[PDB]
Amino acid sequence: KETAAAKFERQHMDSSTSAASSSNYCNQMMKSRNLTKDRCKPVNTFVHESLADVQAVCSQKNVACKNGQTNCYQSYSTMSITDCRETGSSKYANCAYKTTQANKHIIVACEGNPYVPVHFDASV
């Protein structure tokens, strides 16, 4: 099975690039990260920062999680991120994604030992 921390890295970490290079980036990454096999993941966010810089968010501003949970943290600074949202004309198994590049604060839920991000709550 996949540990909740390795899963957050596979679905959200992309430190190799500084930001979405083309409008096909989401179609590319959603595919190389295995997020379109049993269905098209309708929404996913990639962060273009170092894994360390994203794990350090677990020691920043503590805020409520979108589900009420109290183990979410908001990054003090804005981070480079890419938003992948399934387009209306997307069809399993041929997923189509709109890619939107942006700089925003990310909010992730942290868990376990050591305290690492285990779920991407949102960005603002």
Side-chain angles (χ1 to χ4, degrees), residues 54-122:
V54 173
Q55 304 185 315
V57 174
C58 288
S59 77
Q60 300 197 359
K61 190 69 173 180
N62 181 241
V63 290
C65 290
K66 196 128 47 59
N67 69 7
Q69 268 177 343
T70 209
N71 75 112
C72 272
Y73 295 81
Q74 189 180 109
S75 48
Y76 289 143
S77 165
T78 48
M79 287 189 161
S80 192
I81 66 104
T82 293
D83 186 271
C84 296
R85 164 114 354 170
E86 190 181 38
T87 69
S89 43
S90 183
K91 181 79 126 74
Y92 156 39
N94 246 160
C95 311
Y97 285 103
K98 178 184 176 46
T99 120
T100 310
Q101 234 290 139
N103 261 265
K104 304 154 61 176
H105 294 98
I106 66 152
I107 297 151
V108 302
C110 305
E111 250 189 58
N113 198 41
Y115 220 43
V116 296
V118 110
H119 149 85
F120 194 93
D121 202 68

XYZ file of all heavy atoms in Angstrom, residues 54-122:
523
model
N 7.878 22.616 1.491
C 6.439 22.240 1.682
C 6.250 21.503 3.021
O 5.229 21.628 3.662
C 5.972 21.393 0.485
C 4.556 20.851 0.718
C 5.935 22.297 -0.742
N 7.220 20.783 3.476
C 7.059 20.096 4.794
C 7.124 21.111 5.918
O 6.488 20.936 6.936
C 8.166 19.107 4.977
C 8.156 18.163 3.798
C 9.197 17.095 4.048
O 10.302 17.406 4.454
N 8.899 15.840 3.844
N 7.891 22.168 5.726
C 8.020 23.238 6.760
C 6.673 23.982 6.939
O 6.489 24.738 7.883
C 9.100 24.232 6.314
N 5.727 23.776 6.066
C 4.420 24.465 6.235
C 3.728 23.841 7.436
O 2.903 24.461 8.067
C 3.570 24.310 4.966
C 2.179 24.892 5.195
C 4.240 25.075 3.823
N 4.087 22.612 7.766
C 3.476 21.922 8.944
C 3.895 22.606 10.260
O 3.466 22.220 11.322
C 3.945 20.477 8.987
S 3.147 19.562 7.663
N 4.719 23.610 10.207
C 5.121 24.310 11.458
C 4.810 25.806 11.283
O 5.432 26.651 11.884
C 6.616 24.067 11.728
O 7.409 24.885 10.887
N 3.854 26.128 10.435
C 3.527 27.544 10.185
C 2.146 27.878 10.755
O 1.813 27.413 11.814
C 3.643 27.802 8.680
C 5.096 27.474 8.277
C 5.471 28.065 6.907
O 4.674 28.700 6.242
N 6.671 27.887 6.458
N 1.384 28.735 10.123
C 0.064 29.161 10.704
C -0.944 28.015 10.812
O -1.428 27.514 9.811
C -0.531 30.262 9.834
C -1.738 30.875 10.550
C -1.247 31.654 11.761
C -2.406 32.408 12.390
N -1.908 33.170 13.573
N -1.313 27.648 12.033
C -2.339 26.566 12.254
C -3.738 27.134 11.998
O -4.113 28.147 12.575
C -2.251 26.067 13.700
C -3.271 24.940 13.969
O -4.125 25.079 14.806
N -3.217 23.821 13.303
N -4.503 26.486 11.139
C -5.894 26.953 10.819
C -6.830 25.742 10.714
O -6.391 24.606 10.631
C -5.914 27.690 9.470
C -5.186 29.023 9.583
C -5.235 26.837 8.395
N -8.109 25.967 10.701
C -9.068 24.826 10.587
C -8.969 24.159 9.199
O -8.672 24.790 8.201
C -10.497 25.348 10.781
N -9.261 22.900 9.122
C -9.248 22.220 7.805
C -10.606 22.454 7.182
O -11.564 22.745 7.865
C -9.059 20.718 7.966
S -7.377 20.353 8.512
N -10.714 22.306 5.909
C -12.032 22.495 5.249
C -13.077 21.555 5.891
O -14.262 21.828 5.881
C -11.878 22.169 3.766
C -13.071 22.722 2.979
C -12.583 23.574 1.793
C -11.461 22.847 1.017
N -11.948 21.523 0.504
N -12.656 20.447 6.444
C -13.645 19.508 7.064
C -13.806 19.758 8.578
O -14.391 18.951 9.279
C -13.191 18.057 6.814
C -11.921 17.727 7.602
O -11.450 18.497 8.407
N -11.359 16.585 7.422
N -13.308 20.846 9.101
C -13.459 21.092 10.570
C -12.210 20.625 11.321
O -11.898 21.155 12.360
N -11.492 19.649 10.794
C -10.239 19.154 11.468
C -9.365 20.353 11.888
O -9.395 21.411 11.273
C -9.455 18.276 10.492
C -9.862 16.813 10.658
C -9.118 15.943 9.626
O -8.594 16.449 8.643
N -9.098 14.647 9.765
N -8.604 20.212 12.941
C -7.763 21.361 13.420
C -6.258 21.110 13.193
O -5.416 21.729 13.810
C -8.073 21.565 14.916
O -7.874 22.927 15.249
C -7.162 20.689 15.788
N -5.922 20.216 12.291
C -4.472 19.909 12.005
C -4.048 20.417 10.612
O -3.208 19.845 9.961
C -4.238 18.394 12.125
C -4.801 17.661 10.921
O -4.067 17.117 10.137
N -6.077 17.595 10.747
N -4.590 21.519 10.186
C -4.208 22.118 8.872
C -3.268 23.300 9.106
O -3.368 23.971 10.106
C -5.453 22.634 8.173
S -6.156 21.300 7.208
N -2.370 23.568 8.186
C -1.421 24.722 8.349
C -1.372 25.566 7.056
O -1.376 25.035 5.962
C -0.036 24.167 8.678
C -0.109 23.474 10.016
C -0.609 22.169 10.102
C 0.308 24.144 11.180
C -0.697 21.534 11.350
C 0.217 23.508 12.432
C -0.283 22.201 12.516
O -0.368 21.562 13.745
N -1.336 26.882 7.183
C -1.283 27.776 5.978
C 0.140 28.315 5.840
O 0.729 28.807 6.798
C -2.273 28.961 6.128
C -2.365 29.737 4.794
C -3.342 30.925 4.909
O -2.940 32.067 4.915
N -4.613 30.709 4.981
N 0.703 28.218 4.673
C 2.091 28.716 4.478
C 2.138 30.233 4.741
O 1.281 30.987 4.295
C 2.542 28.442 3.039
O 1.521 28.872 2.129
N 3.159 30.691 5.431
C 3.309 32.157 5.690
C 3.431 32.902 4.341
O 2.876 33.965 4.141
C 4.617 32.410 6.461
C 4.527 31.923 7.877
C 5.651 31.341 8.467
C 3.335 32.055 8.601
C 5.586 30.885 9.783
C 3.278 31.599 9.914
C 4.398 31.018 10.497
O 4.322 30.580 11.775
N 4.208 32.350 3.440
C 4.456 33.002 2.123
C 3.642 32.342 0.977
O 3.041 31.279 1.125
C 5.959 32.870 1.853
O 6.251 33.147 0.489
N 3.644 32.977 -0.185
C 2.924 32.417 -1.369
C 3.848 31.418 -2.035
O 5.065 31.545 -1.967
C 2.610 33.506 -2.367
O 3.774 34.266 -2.586
C 1.511 34.413 -1.827
N 3.292 30.413 -2.658
C 4.137 29.384 -3.313
C 3.708 29.184 -4.779
O 2.555 29.376 -5.134
C 3.974 28.070 -2.553
C 4.702 28.148 -1.217
S 4.714 26.503 -0.498
C 6.065 26.729 0.669
N 4.626 28.782 -5.627
C 4.276 28.542 -7.055
C 3.475 27.267 -7.134
O 3.885 26.236 -6.648
C 5.541 28.388 -7.907
O 5.179 28.447 -9.291
N 2.338 27.315 -7.724
C 1.516 26.095 -7.812
C 0.794 26.062 -9.146
O 0.627 27.083 -9.801
C 0.493 26.088 -6.667
C -0.501 27.219 -6.843
C 1.196 26.283 -5.327
C -1.805 26.638 -7.356
N 0.341 24.892 -9.533
C -0.413 24.750 -10.810
C -1.725 24.067 -10.499
O -1.762 23.038 -9.849
C 0.362 23.890 -11.826
O 1.521 24.564 -12.233
C -0.486 23.629 -13.056
N -2.796 24.625 -10.958
C -4.126 24.026 -10.700
C -4.596 23.183 -11.914
O -4.721 23.687 -13.018
C -5.100 25.170 -10.452
C -6.444 24.601 -10.045
O -7.254 24.336 -10.932
O -6.640 24.437 -8.848
N -4.878 21.910 -11.701
C -5.370 21.021 -12.810
C -6.837 20.727 -12.558
O -7.194 20.131 -11.558
C -4.611 19.689 -12.831
S -2.867 19.971 -13.187
N -7.687 21.154 -13.446
C -9.150 20.929 -13.278
C -9.683 20.239 -14.532
O -9.495 20.698 -15.652
C -9.820 22.289 -13.067
C -11.338 22.178 -13.276
C -12.182 22.418 -11.985
N -11.355 22.563 -10.737
C -11.909 22.958 -9.615
N -13.176 22.793 -9.398
N -11.164 23.462 -8.684
N -10.327 19.131 -14.353
C -10.874 18.372 -15.513
C -11.814 19.277 -16.336
O -12.726 19.884 -15.798
C -11.628 17.162 -14.964
C -11.990 16.212 -16.106
C -12.774 14.999 -15.573
O -13.589 15.163 -14.664
O -12.555 13.922 -16.099
N -11.598 19.381 -17.635
C -12.494 20.262 -18.487
C -13.841 19.580 -18.675
O -13.988 18.392 -18.441
C -11.900 20.500 -19.882
O -11.941 19.292 -20.624
C -10.456 20.968 -19.778
N -14.833 20.308 -19.114
C -16.170 19.677 -19.334
C -16.021 18.569 -20.382
O -16.590 17.498 -20.251
N -15.247 18.823 -21.419
C -15.056 17.801 -22.492
C -13.916 16.835 -22.129
O -13.033 16.553 -22.934
C -14.773 18.477 -23.847
O -13.854 19.560 -23.690
N -13.979 16.246 -20.950
C -12.962 15.230 -20.558
C -13.694 13.890 -20.430
O -14.791 13.827 -19.906
C -12.299 15.565 -19.216
O -11.293 14.589 -18.954
N -13.115 12.837 -20.912
C -13.815 11.544 -20.841
C -12.897 10.356 -20.566
O -12.039 10.002 -21.331
C -14.522 11.351 -22.163
C -15.277 10.043 -22.133
C -16.572 10.228 -21.345
C -17.745 9.770 -22.209
N -17.751 8.280 -22.268
N -13.154 9.741 -19.459
C -12.455 8.512 -18.965
C -12.518 7.404 -20.066
O -13.581 7.113 -20.588
C -13.294 8.176 -17.673
C -13.277 6.746 -17.209
C -12.116 5.983 -17.269
C -14.464 6.193 -16.675
C -12.124 4.660 -16.801
C -14.478 4.871 -16.208
C -13.303 4.103 -16.275
O -13.314 2.801 -15.808
N -11.417 6.782 -20.519
C -10.019 7.015 -19.997
C -9.221 8.088 -20.802
O -8.002 8.034 -20.842
C -9.258 5.683 -20.049
N -9.850 9.080 -21.374
C -9.045 10.150 -22.062
C -9.336 11.475 -21.366
O -10.166 12.279 -21.779
C -9.341 10.253 -23.554
C -8.096 9.849 -24.336
O -8.220 9.522 -25.483
N -6.904 9.908 -23.800
N -8.649 11.670 -20.281
C -8.818 12.877 -19.445
C -8.261 14.111 -20.116
O -7.173 14.090 -20.669
C -8.083 12.664 -18.145
S -8.552 11.042 -17.483
N -8.995 15.190 -20.001
C -8.577 16.522 -20.558
C -8.508 17.483 -19.361
O -9.408 17.488 -18.535
C -9.645 16.984 -21.551
N -7.450 18.248 -19.207
C -7.330 19.127 -18.006
C -7.030 20.572 -18.375
O -6.185 20.844 -19.197
C -6.156 18.611 -17.133
C -6.574 17.348 -16.403
C -6.141 16.091 -16.861
C -7.419 17.433 -15.288
C -6.552 14.922 -16.207
C -7.839 16.269 -14.640
C -7.407 15.010 -15.100
O -7.842 13.857 -14.478
N -7.645 21.489 -17.688
C -7.326 22.931 -17.890
C -6.172 23.205 -16.928
O -6.268 22.874 -15.755
C -8.539 23.805 -17.510
C -8.210 25.304 -17.657
C -9.416 26.135 -17.165
C -9.097 27.645 -17.189
N -8.444 27.997 -18.465
N -5.089 23.775 -17.374
C -3.978 24.028 -16.417
C -3.935 25.521 -16.107
O -3.919 26.352 -16.994
C -2.597 23.490 -16.916
O -1.643 24.532 -17.033
C -2.720 22.776 -18.248
N -3.931 25.855 -14.836
C -3.887 27.289 -14.414
C -2.680 27.484 -13.503
O -2.602 26.890 -12.442
C -5.169 27.676 -13.650
O -6.320 27.275 -14.397
C -5.202 29.198 -13.431
N -1.732 28.296 -13.901
C -0.532 28.525 -13.036
C -0.846 29.667 -12.059
O -1.542 30.613 -12.398
C 0.691 28.904 -13.893
C 1.868 27.954 -13.565
C 2.438 28.219 -12.132
O 2.761 27.291 -11.416
N 2.564 29.439 -11.679
N -0.350 29.595 -10.853
C -0.630 30.688 -9.881
C 0.394 30.696 -8.741
O 1.120 29.729 -8.523
C -2.026 30.477 -9.297
N 0.408 31.783 -7.996
C 1.305 31.930 -6.802
C 0.389 32.146 -5.605
O -0.281 33.153 -5.529
C 2.197 33.152 -6.965
C 3.574 32.723 -7.463
O 4.489 32.524 -6.677
N 3.752 32.543 -8.737
N 0.289 31.200 -4.708
C -0.649 31.388 -3.578
C -0.191 30.653 -2.345
O 0.712 29.849 -2.386
C -2.023 30.857 -3.927
C -2.552 31.500 -5.195
C -3.540 30.523 -5.838
C -4.691 30.269 -4.869
N -5.710 29.407 -5.519
N -0.854 30.926 -1.252
C -0.540 30.256 0.018
C -1.143 28.879 -0.086
O -2.241 28.730 -0.598
C -1.219 30.980 1.213
C -0.658 32.358 1.425
N -1.294 33.482 0.939
C 0.465 32.808 2.076
C -0.555 34.553 1.298
N 0.530 34.189 1.996
N -0.483 27.880 0.407
C -1.083 26.520 0.351
C -1.515 26.124 1.764
O -0.899 26.498 2.732
C -0.074 25.470 -0.207
C 1.110 25.290 0.754
C 0.459 25.928 -1.566
C 1.685 23.888 0.603
N -2.553 25.361 1.879
C -3.027 24.904 3.207
C -3.030 23.377 3.174
O -3.733 22.758 2.379
C -4.438 25.454 3.452
C -4.381 26.977 3.498
C -4.998 24.932 4.774
C -5.716 27.544 3.032
N -2.224 22.762 3.988
C -2.150 21.277 3.975
C -2.401 20.737 5.368
O -2.141 21.389 6.355
C -0.762 20.800 3.476
C -0.487 21.350 2.079
C 0.339 21.289 4.421
N -2.889 19.536 5.436
C -3.151 18.893 6.732
C -1.913 18.073 7.093
O -1.382 17.359 6.256
C -4.365 17.988 6.587
N -1.421 18.173 8.305
C -0.186 17.395 8.662
C -0.507 16.290 9.641
O -1.457 16.360 10.394
C 0.872 18.318 9.238
S 1.169 19.644 8.047
N 0.264 15.240 9.599
C -0.025 14.089 10.479
C 1.200 13.233 10.758
O 2.163 13.199 10.014
C -0.990 13.168 9.747
C -2.374 13.178 10.384
C -3.210 12.058 9.737
O -2.783 10.910 9.801
O -4.251 12.368 9.178
N 1.053 12.453 11.796
C 2.052 11.428 12.198
C 3.399 11.970 12.648
O 3.588 13.121 13.003
N 4.316 11.065 12.649
C 5.691 11.331 13.062
C 6.601 10.812 11.943
O 6.575 9.635 11.605
C 5.962 10.558 14.357
C 7.189 11.118 15.080
O 7.383 12.324 15.147
N 8.036 10.278 15.624
N 7.361 11.702 11.400
C 7.370 13.120 11.824
C 6.181 13.902 11.227
O 5.505 13.442 10.311
C 8.699 13.628 11.280
C 9.086 12.675 10.110
C 8.291 11.374 10.307
N 5.929 15.073 11.749
C 4.803 15.906 11.248
C 5.019 16.283 9.764
O 5.684 17.260 9.458
C 4.730 17.184 12.090
C 3.297 17.530 12.369
C 2.383 16.537 12.732
C 2.889 18.856 12.276
C 1.054 16.883 12.987
C 1.563 19.195 12.533
C 0.654 18.215 12.894
O -0.639 18.568 13.160
N 4.439 15.525 8.844
C 4.581 15.844 7.372
C 3.198 16.068 6.772
O 2.223 15.526 7.265
C 5.219 14.691 6.616
C 6.638 14.460 7.116
C 4.389 13.424 6.819
N 3.136 16.836 5.700
C 1.865 17.104 5.030
C 1.308 15.786 4.492
O 2.012 14.949 3.939
C 2.207 18.176 3.987
C 3.727 18.115 3.784
C 4.305 17.466 5.054
N 0.064 15.555 4.756
C -0.565 14.260 4.382
C -1.815 14.481 3.512
O -2.443 13.544 3.070
C -0.898 13.586 5.723
C -2.399 13.538 5.977
C -0.330 12.185 5.751
N -2.171 15.706 3.259
C -3.369 15.981 2.429
C -3.348 17.468 2.021
O -2.974 18.325 2.805
C -4.587 15.591 3.285
C -5.779 16.433 2.980
N -6.644 16.139 1.946
C -6.292 17.553 3.597
C -7.634 17.063 1.972
N -7.466 17.951 2.962
N -3.707 17.774 0.800
C -3.696 19.198 0.316
C -5.082 19.795 0.546
O -6.004 19.519 -0.173
C -3.364 19.203 -1.179
C -3.005 20.600 -1.643
C -1.663 21.012 -1.664
C -4.001 21.474 -2.058
C -1.325 22.299 -2.100
C -3.668 22.760 -2.493
C -2.329 23.173 -2.513
N -5.260 20.590 1.573
C -6.624 21.145 1.848
C -7.005 22.211 0.849
O -8.125 22.247 0.387
C -6.679 21.744 3.252
C -8.141 21.799 3.714
O -8.719 20.737 3.925
O -8.657 22.892 3.838
N -6.112 23.090 0.535
C -6.470 24.157 -0.416
C -5.334 25.151 -0.521
O -4.331 25.043 0.165
C -7.714 24.890 0.118
